[PDB]
């Protein structure tokens, strides 16, 4: 909305590299949730080390 801006550059060797100034990057965040491991409310899955 503020006007035409750079977001990256491209070259035959430098396949598309962004300028690390993308506003979209920040906005969407996530609440930190605190809890405690006790059954059956929160438990580690067998395959948790793959997740």
């Amino acid at each position: 909305t503020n006007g035409p801006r750079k977001i990256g550059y491209w070259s035959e060797v430098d396949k598309m590299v962004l300028t690390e100034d993308d506003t979209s990057g920040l906005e969407q965040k996530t609440v930190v949730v605190t809890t405690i491991l006790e059954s059956p409310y929160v438990m580690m899955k067998k395959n948790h080390e793959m997740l």
């Binding site: 909305t1 006007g3 035409p4 750079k6 977001i7 491209w10």
Partner: protein
């Protein structure tokens, strides 16, 4: 889709028809691989048929992203992106642009 041979004498409903056919597939992402003086005309028709709200996304596939009359789609909310070979951040370009303008 070919858009070149739409003659200036009837370049009004043909562009509306063109996008109405795309609305059969409900297409949203569009590449405009056209010369500057045809990017303007299709962007102008893109507003007039209302298809520049957020949801659409046009890529201007030419080295003159800033050179067209870009402003009128800046606000509709459909993102627009493309390419430019000249970069006005360069001091030589800026000094040229002063000397040029």
């Amino acid at each position: 889709i070919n858009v070149g041979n739409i003659n200036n004498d009837k370049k009004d409903e043909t562009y509306r028809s063109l996008f109405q056919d795309l609305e059969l597939k409900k297409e949203r992402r569009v590449i405009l691989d056209c010369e500057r003086d045809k990017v303007n005309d299709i962007v102008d028709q893109v507003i007039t048929i209302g298809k520049h709200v957020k949801g659409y996304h046009y890529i201007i596939a030419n080295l003159g992203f800033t050179d067209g009359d870009l402003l009128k789609i800046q606000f509709g909310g459909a993102e627009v992106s493309g390419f430019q070979i000249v970069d006005y951040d360069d001091s030589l370009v800026s000094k040229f642009i002063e000397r040029w303008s």
